[PDB]
Ligand binder design. Structure first.
Ligand code: CDL
Ligand code: CDL
Ligand code: CDL
Ligand code: CDL
Ligand code: PC1
Ligand code: HEM
Ligand code: HEM
Ligand code: A1IJD
Ligand code: AOQ
Lengths: 32, 192, 360, 218, 77, 182, 282, 96
């Protein structure tokens, strides 16, 4: 158990990956 | 003559204290009486194994992880609203000072975002004592001023110069000396 | 006075990481201003006579345009005054704000005392059963000194004279409040606010654009919630028993103060000696006052980080909060041996965890 | 002895104002003469230009210290106290030089000084003053001229010459309560005389200087 | 080689080095946890330290500091 | 400021020459300039890769320091209890610290082979640095971690619309609701 | 003064000053002291000279052979810095404690720079001599030169000349010197110029002192003190410590240039001076 | 507020009243720094919040578990046990 544990806490790998995603030079509401 | 008699009392007591003075370092008497030392020594094997041990280990784990998340050192927790530490910071050299400034900036930003650092950024010991040589000097310097100037309750002129008169040396730091002007543009103490 | 306005509320520079927990002061001030508006417009139609006060309050609701709205806004905003104050206090217990904001903390305590007094005086003016018997109880509680109680009452028992002077006092005290608020803010901005991180930092940012908008956002939420509760009545904040006319020779069969007074009530239920009762309040308030100079009670140099995150030990402030909530729970219930037993347990916790804050 | 002021206002001689304030003293032969010689030293002197090795802001003399810390810049160019004894009367007081806008503090600080002698002086200060007074007086009497002048002066003033041991023995036994007695006898709630020259727009009233001689505290 | 977060110092002429601790053998119960050091080898503390107790401590704290008060209260209040 | 210090003698807290709460091992240089060299000769823990929390280096200082009833925090460094007239002599053989009082009121700086004026010069507070200093003390290059997003992934670039209409419409909407309520 | 032991107060209260209070016990039959100079030397090299005239106040002075004529292009201004740092922190005393103690003993003390000498001196009652010998010798035995004292003491280097602008006579003196020996030895200025505030770091001060402040370049002189006590308390000062070791320094002959110089300012007189050299000097 | 050695200015122009608080809290930039900002009219401002939601929420919830919830659970326990004791009392004392 890493959650809430000062001996082990760290993000899950999928949370570390969610921060790598990119939407640079895209915009989906431009028509409005 | 009341005052001279009480003088005599004070003087004799002070002379007793003076006569017992050592001329060299002598180890301090223990902080606890022999009864409590005995009781602690008796209960050590249970108390340290079950309770004190884990408490003192959990504490350091908590502290270390919180400091590493943000990239602070331990001596980054002290303020400069504390006179001794203010002096210590005045005595610092350029490099240490600059690094402290940078770490405080980064810690502020990270606590704003509430994002952990990567674990490879957390590989350092946060509990190095980098302020000690300067805190000891500050303590010396601020102790001598008490000894040589602060030994009496000095008497002053009241509510003059922007200071209350009971000891302050910075203007308008107390309510009864607020609002120094009614017209004009004011001013600042640092530009006098 | 415009130049001061700009210096303190536009160009004043804060720390970047001030989150919502630092917005509740502004909020209590706003509930003050709002409560003052509704106060004054309620005074225009209230009657200060024991023979007819009750019906005077009923006339507003029944026969006056928008009569109901001002009474209910005034009644409900009080709860938010106290809720915001308690959040505001607990934040600074959590952070150890009083380490360097010494006089601000003292001023705070004085303002809280003012608010208690103001609320309790207000609570008597509608003149129902609960009002009369509450006044009786609290006036008997401060009896230790001869003749002080008939003097403050005006009379041998709670009377129309008592109503008249309570009304005038309730009129006056809030404005003294306002003056002390100015004093409060003087001490505050003399020093400068603390961070949630409890470090000193140069990453400051000005107030007007960034923090002003957060203040405004929370203000929207609070206005929302006040109107929700005021118009629809979701929670039974006030007991029904103040709806009954007064009788000087018969008590109500069940008794529950306003929630912000229940913990105190709990104490009066469980401590045997009446003087012990009163001394508990005096002692706890003195202990809170004592925190203003905590730097002197020890020779180790102090830090503001209490390292309560991820900590299995928790912290004395959290135990204090839970003890206080438990006391509210027990306050609410009937007098019975088991409730009293757990009452005494909770009371010991509440007293001890306050004493212990000084022992770093 | 008349309590009056005599002020020469003049704004065409630069920024500096000169002032002297005086009290009634005691004759040569008075028993308290020595105590007066000591009080003059307890108030002492100061110069902003030339200072020795002790900064004024940390000096043991409280009057100098209070003057040098005023408005953080300090409010006087020079001040010095004085005592003069005549055959049947004396003068006791001080002389000062200060800036046009500093004059008020420049004067009231030193009046506060002198009024302290009757309420709050302590033996640290008395012994410092004894040390400095002894250094001064015993330091002059080196050459033949100083000795001959002293012989003649004492011969006219006392009908004799007082030997060193007598002066030292009479000086030794004065403590704080004795100073606090004599001052209360002659200086508390007394008349004062004033003279000044220069940019005296700042100058205090005569009645201010006269009501200064007592404290309402205590 | 060395205990704790130290690394062997370079030999630089003009700098005087303090003595540094050699490494010590670790005990059972510290597998897979953020490491926190043990007492020195010649102390009295190292006779009674037991890392395996850090797992039950969240219960030990409550038992010790709140159970006796509960017992006393139920006995007398 | 309005804040005092609290330098006073104390019987619960022995002075720092007697019982320091920090880890009392310091290296000493003949001249602080030499500290430059070590910064370009040592290894550093932050130059090397780790992946799990269990691999982080372990603190040098002991967890077991502060004791007493109802003391949550178990670790501290600095205190202002006052020094005596004759302080405890530092033992430089064990790399203990010598600073302020312990330089002035002690023989610690004395050397048989060297002039006194030369000998005292090595005991300014810049001449001492803890053990582990060059290896553990961070010195950031930026406030931003390369593992977090900055403006580069949110900036509206070439080809984008103008948003002034939207911004001012947002705020006008807020205001007209506000005015109706008022 | 925590209370006072004697309660008798002013025992001569109310006695006029033309009425004696001496008892016959306090009379003496006068014996003069002997007032020819006494000469001694410590083992490390220090020379001591003393006289007594039976005065109550003593004069004490330490003389060092370190003037400004010994500086060079890398040193200019160092002697002024040292003088401006007199009675600052040393091995066993702080600056504050030193000056406050000198004040409370009642003494007057100071330091003076010339073109060939540096002098420290003090003065008060003769019974305080044992407490003054340390504070005078400290300055040459083991000063610390903490940076934050150098930095705070800097403005006094400039005021020294800023005051010369209203002392025309002294000004002309300095002009004469710098014109007579242009750019060498006695020609050097007695103050720190702007160019002199660069090398205001402890290492230059310390390296300069190591070349001049050895004992055999010093003299200690006392007037109105008993010589065996002076010798004893001076010996007890150098016994524990290593003094600055000797150096076989050499000194160059001044070169006299002469020349001419003018300096105009609103003074209402024409001040003029003409001079010629004395070959060989003292 | 700030220590006197930090609030000492380099300039000498008079501080205007409306800037009082600004220069009472002056601090030195030891070592200097470089900063960049983009006008909020040229940034996305609701996508950056949701893009970093899970990390922020993990951090916040992790930080509060032990200190706030565990004592909460214990208190909730105590309330349940008190209810038990009362519901047994009320029968012992008054039911035959
Ligand atoms: C608006 C105000 C009006 C304007 C004018 C100003 C008015 C003030 C006048 C009263 C003061 C008289 C006393 C003069 C003392 C002079 C001492 C001295 O040389 O000065 C240096 C000295 C400080 O130098 P320091 O020693 O270097 O500083 C170190 C610290 O002091 C730390 O030192 P330490 O830690 O080493 O400890 C030292 C401590 C050691 O001692 C203790 O700590 C003892 C503790 C024992 C507990 C018991 C309580 C002690 C306090 C007594 C209070 C009683 C007074 C009230 C009586 C009421 C009568 C009706 O020493 C003392 O306590 C000795 C002084 C105590 C005197 C306090 C009372 C004086 C009042 C006398 C007149 C009373 C009439 C009032 C009428 C009713 C209206 C108020 O000055 C003081 O210590 C100040 C003491 C006096 C208090 C400040 C005055 C108040 C100013 C603010 C006004 C607030 C008014 C609020 C009303 C607002 C209305 C809207
Ligand atoms: C979300 C929070 C809201 C707070 C509200 C407070 C109450 C306000 C009352 C007065 C009114 C004021 C109005 C303004 C409120 C503030 C607004 C605001 O800006 O909030 C910001 C708030 C948090 O902002 P932040 O920047 O994170 O704040 C900093 C943090 O505090 C972090 O600060 P830090 O990290 O620097 O920490 C400093 C420290 C400083 O210390 C403090 O401040 C401590 C203060 C504690 C309180 C002490 C006083 C207590 C006095 C006694 C009161 C008794 C009241 C009794 C009431 C009884 C009611 C029954 O604070 C803490 O430590 C706080 C952490 C506490 C953790 C506690 C964890 C508890 C877990 C509970 C789990 C429960 C599970 C149940 C499972 C059940 C299963 C059956 O964010 C939001 O609220 C976001 C907006 C969410 C909007 C959602 C709307 C949804 C609507 C849905 C409608 C659906 C319609 C469906 C229709 C369907 C049709 C078909
Ligand atoms: C409707 C409400 C209306 C309220 C109005 C109140 C008006 C009072 C004004 C206060 C006095 C002015 C303060 C300015 C001070 C300036 C700061 C300064 O540097 O002063 C240095 C100065 C110290 O002198 P120093 O530095 O040693 O050297 C002085 C110079 O050498 C030589 O001195 P100087 O030539 O430089 O002149 C100094 C002059 C500075 O002033 C001026 O230059 C301008 C003139 C001052 C204003 C004069 C008009 C005030 C009218 C007085 C009557 C008000 C009665 C109000 C009753 C309301 C009825 C509904 O100060 C004075 O002489 C003031 C003396 C009068 C104040 C003392 C009154 C307390 C008597 C308490 C007796 C016990 C009664 C208990 C029963 C309850 C009674 C309610 O400080 C003072 O002595 C000033 C007074 C300090 C306050 C003492 C404590 C007051 C509390 C009294 C007890 C409260 C009773 C409440 C209980 C209720 C029971 C039910
Ligand atoms: C007419 C009828 C008469 C009946 C008479 C009956 C009388 C009964 C009296 C019972 C007295 C019990 C206490 C004996 C103490 C002995 C002390 C001793 O020998 O010292 C030697 C010796 C003293 O030397 P020393 O130099 O002081 O060394 C010790 C260190 O200073 C220590 O510091 P350290 O650093 O080494 O250790 C860490 C430190 C620091 O640790 C921490 O800070 C950790 C804190 C973690 C807290 C985590 C909490 C998280 C959960 C929160 C949950 C939410 C709660 C709130 C909300 C709930 C809703 C309301 O730990 C502590 O501070 C431990 C505190 C323990 C408190 C225990 C309190 C027991 C109270 C019992 C009731 C008494 C009466 C109540 C009042 C009555 C009305 C006035 O100490 C030791 O060797 C250590 C001994 C420690 C013993 C602790 C455990 C005692 C267990 C007693 C069991 C009693 C059962 C009674 C049953 C009754 C049935 C009828
Ligand atoms: C002087 C007394 C005034 C009382 C106000 C009551 C008036 C009647 C009811 C409201 C009417 C509508 C509002 C007026 C129109 C808008 C003003 C305007 O022209 O916009 C200027 C500007 C509009 O800016 P903008 O950027 O939207 O657009 C202007 C730019 N152009 C023209 C290019 C589009 O408003 C501001 O910038 C105001 C800044 C503050 C915004 C947040 C305020 C929220 C509230 C904060 C806390 C409140 C508590 C403090 C009060 C004390 C009492 C409790
Ligand atoms: C912080 C400010 C205030 C607080 C906390 C407060 C609190 C209260 C409370 C709790 C009540 C009880 C109402 C009820 O039980 O229905 C009340 C009633 C009342 N308040 Fe205040 N009040 C404040 C300010 C004011 C002011 C400034 C005035 C007038 C100037 C005022 C006038 C009244 C009146 C007339 C009532 C009677 C309401 C009724 O009879 O229905 N209040 N107040
Ligand atoms: C009417 C009642 C009160 C008002 C109007 C008020 C107002 C404010 C305001 C506006 C602030 C600055 C912004 C903020 O913190 O939200 C503040 C800060 C503060 N207040 Fe209050 N407050 C009140 C009651 C209290 C109480 C009862 C206390 C303490 C018991 C208190 C102690 C503090 C402290 C310590 C701070 C600063 C904390 C820090 O900077 O870390 N205040 N107050
Ligand atoms: C989120 O972080 C913060 C929020 C903050 N919010 C506010 C509202 C202020 C503030 C309050 C009052 C003030 O000046 C006033 C005093 C008294 C008055 O009187 C009265 F009664 F309020 F109307 C009015 C006006 C000046 C500034 C802060 O300083 C403040 C500081 C921080 Cl860190
Ligand atoms: O029995 C009580 C009672 O005990 C109180 C109490 C509640 C706490 C109050 C209180 C206590 C302390 C403070 Cl600082 C402020 C208010 C005083 C009145 C009531 O409010 C009450 C109202 C109506 C009928 C009966 C009663």
């Amino acid at each position: 158990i890493r959650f809430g544990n000062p001996w082990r806490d760290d993000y899950p790998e999928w949370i570390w990956k969610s921060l790598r995603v990119s939407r640079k030079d895209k915009d989906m509401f431009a028509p409005f | 003559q009341f005052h001279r008699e009480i003088g005599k009392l004070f003087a004799s007591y002070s002379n007793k204290i003076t006569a017992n003075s050592p001329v060299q370092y002598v180890p301090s008497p223990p902080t606890k009486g022999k009864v409590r030392r005995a009781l602690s020594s008796a209960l050590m094997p249970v108390w340290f194994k079950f309770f004190r041990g884990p408490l003192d280990r959990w504490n350091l784990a908590v502290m270390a992880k919180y400091l590493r998340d943000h990239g602070l050192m331990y001596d980054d927790l002290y303020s400069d609203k504390e006179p001794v530490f203010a002096r210590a910071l005045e005595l610092l050299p350029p490099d240490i000072q600059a690094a402290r400034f940078r770490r405080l900036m980064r810690g502020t930003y990270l606590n704003h975002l509430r994002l952990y650092l990567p674990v490879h950024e957390q590989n350092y010991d946060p509990f190095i004592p980098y302020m000690a040589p300067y805190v000891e000097e500050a303590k010396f310097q601020l102790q001598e001023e008490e000894e040589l100037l602060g030994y009496h309750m000095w008497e002053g002129v009241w509510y003059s110069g922007g200071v209350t008169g009971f000891g302050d040396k910075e203007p308008g730091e107390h309510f009864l000396v607020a609002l120094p002007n009614l017209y004009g543009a004011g001013g600042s103490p640092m530009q006098a | 006075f415009m130049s001061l306005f700009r210096a303190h509320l536009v160009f004043y520079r804060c720390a970047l990481n001030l989150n919502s927990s630092y917005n509740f002061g502004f909020l209590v001030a706003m509930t003050f201003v709002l409560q003052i508006i509704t106060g004054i417009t309620l005074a225009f139609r209230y009657t200060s006579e024991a023979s007819c006060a009750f019906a005077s309050v009923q006339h507003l609701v029944r026969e006056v345009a928008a009569g109901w709205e001002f009474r209910m806004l005034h009644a409900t905003t009080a709860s938010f005054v106290f809720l915001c104050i308690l959040i505001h206090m607990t934040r600074g217990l959590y952070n150890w704000s009083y380490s360097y904001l010494t006089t601000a903390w003292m001023s705070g305590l004085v303002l809280y005392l003012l608010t208690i007094a103001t609320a309790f005086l207000g609570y008597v003016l509608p003149w129902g059963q609960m009002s009369f018997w509450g006044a009786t109880v609290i006036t008997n509680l401060l009896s230790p000194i001869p003749y002080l109680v008939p003097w403050l009452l005006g009379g041998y028992y709670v009377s129309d004279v008592t109503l008249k002077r309570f009304f005038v006092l309730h009129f006056i005290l809030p404005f003294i409040g306002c003056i002390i608020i100015v004093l409060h803010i003087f001490y505050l901005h003399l020093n400068g606010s603390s961070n949630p991180a409890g470090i000193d930092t140069a990453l400051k940012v000005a107030f007007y654009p960034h923090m002003l908008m957060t203040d405004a956002k929370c203000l929207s939420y609070l206005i929302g919630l006040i109107f929700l509760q005021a118009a629809f009545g979701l929670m039974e904040l006030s007991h029904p028993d103040n709806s009954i006319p007064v009788n000087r020779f018969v008590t109500p069969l069940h008794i529950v103060p306003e929630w912000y007074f229940l913990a105190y009530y709990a104490v009066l239920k469980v401590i045997p000696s009446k003087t012990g009762g009163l001394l508990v309040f005096m002692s706890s308030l003195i202990n809170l006052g004592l925190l203003s100079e905590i730097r002197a009670l020890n020779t180790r140099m102090l830090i503001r980080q209490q390292f309560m995150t991820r900590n299995v030990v928790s912290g004395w402030v959290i135990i204090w909060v839970y003890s206080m909530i438990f006391l509210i729970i027990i306050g609410s219930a009937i007098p019975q041996a088991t409730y009293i037993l757990y009452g005494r347990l909770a009371t010991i916790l509440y007293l001890t965890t306050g004493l212990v804050l000084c022992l770093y | 002895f008349c309590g009056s002021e005599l002020l020469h206002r003049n704004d065409d001689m630069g920024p500096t104002a000169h002032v002297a304030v005086g009290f009634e003293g005691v004759p040569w032969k008075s028993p308290d003469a020595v105590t007066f010689m000591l009080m003059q030293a307890i108030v002492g002197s100061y110069r902003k230009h030339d200072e020795g090795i002790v900064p004024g802001k940390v000096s043991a003399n409280a009057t100098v210290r209070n003057v040098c810390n005023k408005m953080t810049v300090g409010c006087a160019d020079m001040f010095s106290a004085f005592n003069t004894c005549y055959s049947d009367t004396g003068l006791f007081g001080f002389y000062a030089q200060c800036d046009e806008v500093a004059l008020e503090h420049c004067v009231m600080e030193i009046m506060f000084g002198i009024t302290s002698l009757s309420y709050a002086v302590t033996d640290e200060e008395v012994e410092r003053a004894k040390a400095q007074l002894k250094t001064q007086l015993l330091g002059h009497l080196d050459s033949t001229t100083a000795v001959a002048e002293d012989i003649g002066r004492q011969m006219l003033a006392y009908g004799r010459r007082m030997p060193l041991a007598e002066f030292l023995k009479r000086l030794e036994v004065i403590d704080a309560e004795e100073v606090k007695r004599v001052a209360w006898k002659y200086l508390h709630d007394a008349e004062v005389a004033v003279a000044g020259l220069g940019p005296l727009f700042g100058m205090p009233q005569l009645i201010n200087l006269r009501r200064a001689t007592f404290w309402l505290r205590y | 080689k060395l205990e704790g977060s130290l690394l062997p110092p370079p030999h630089i002429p003009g700098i005087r080095r303090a003595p540094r601790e050699p490494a010590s053998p670790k005990m059972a119960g510290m597998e897979g946890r953020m490491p926190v050091r043990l007492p020195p080898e010649g102390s009295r503390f190292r006779q009674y330290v037991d890392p395996r107790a850090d797992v039950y401590f969240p219960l030990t704290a409550v038992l010790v500091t709140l159970g006796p008060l509960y017992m006393f209260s139920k006995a007398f209040f | 400021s309005v804040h005092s210090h609290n330098i006073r003698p104390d019987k619960h807290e022995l002075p720092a020459s007697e019982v320091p709460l920090y880890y009392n091992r310091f290296d000493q240089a003949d001249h602080p300039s030499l500290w430059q060299l070590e910064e370009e000769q040592q290894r550093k823990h932050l130059d090397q890769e780790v992946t799990d929390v269990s691999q982080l280096v372990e603190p040098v200082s002991s967890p077991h320091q502060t004791e007493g009833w109802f003391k949550r925090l178990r670790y501290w460094h600095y205190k202002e209890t006052a020094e005596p007239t004759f302080p405890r002599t530092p033992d430089l053989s064990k790399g203990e610290l010598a600073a302020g009082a312990t330089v002035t009121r002690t023989s610690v700086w004395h050397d048989p082979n060297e002039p006194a004026i030369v000998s005292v010069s090595r005991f300014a507070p810049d001449n001492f640095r803890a053990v582990g200093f060059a290896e553990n003390v961070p010195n950031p290059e930026s406030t931003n971690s390369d593992s977090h997003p900055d403006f580069r992934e949110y900036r509206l670039g070439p080809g984008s619309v103008d948003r002034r209409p939207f911004v001012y419409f947002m705020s006008a909407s807020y205001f007209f609701i506000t005015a109706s309520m008022m | 003064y925590v209370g006072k032991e004697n309660t008798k107060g002013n025992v001569y209260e109310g006695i006029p000053l033309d009425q004696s209070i001496l008892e016959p016990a306090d009379l003496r039959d006068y014996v003069p002291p002997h007032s020819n100079i006494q000469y001694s030397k410590l083992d490390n090299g220090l020379r001591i000279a003393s006289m007594d005239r039976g005065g109550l106040t003593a004069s004490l002075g330490l003389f060092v052979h370190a003037g400004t004529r010994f500086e060079d292009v890398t040193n200019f201004g160092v002697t002024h810095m040292i003088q401006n740092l007199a009675f600052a922190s040393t091995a066993h005393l702080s600056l504050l404690r030193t000056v406050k103690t000198i004040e409370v003993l009642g003494a007057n003390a100071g330091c003076v720079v010339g073109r060939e000498h540096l002098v420290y001196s003090a003065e008060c009652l003769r019974s305080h001599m044992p407490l003054l010998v340390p504070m005078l010798t400290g300055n040459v035995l083991f000063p610390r030169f903490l940076p934050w004292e150098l930095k705070a003491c800097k403005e006094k280097l400039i005021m020294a000349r800023k005051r010369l602008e209203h002392m025309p006579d002294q000004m002309v003196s300095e002009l004469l010197h710098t014109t007579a020996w242009h750019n060498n030895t006695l020609g050097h200025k007695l103050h720190c110029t702007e160019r002199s505030l660069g090398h205001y770091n402890p290492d230059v001060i310390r390296h300069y002192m190591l070349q001049h402040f050895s004992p055999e370049n010093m003299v200690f002189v006392g007037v109105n003190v008993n010589h065996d006590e002076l010798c004893t308390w001076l010996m007890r000062a150098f016994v524990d410590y290593n003094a600055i070791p000797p150096s076989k320094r050499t000194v160059a002959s001044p070169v006299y240039t002469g020349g001419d110089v003018r300096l105009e300012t609103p003074s209402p007189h024409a001040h003029m001076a003409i001079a010629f050299e004395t070959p060989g000097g003292w | 507020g700030a220590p006197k050695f930090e609030r000492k200015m380099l300039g000498s122009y008079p501080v205007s009243p409306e800037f009082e608080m600004v220069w009472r809290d002056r601090l030195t930039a030891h070592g200097g720094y470089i900063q960049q900002t983009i006008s909020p009219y040229q940034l996305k401002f609701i996508y950056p919040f949701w893009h970093t939601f899970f990390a922020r929420c993990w951090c916040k919830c992790s930080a509060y578990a032990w200190p706030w919830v565990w004592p909460g659970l214990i208190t909730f326990g105590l309330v349940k046990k008190m209810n038990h004791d009362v519901e047994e009392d009320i029968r012992d004392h008054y039911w035959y």
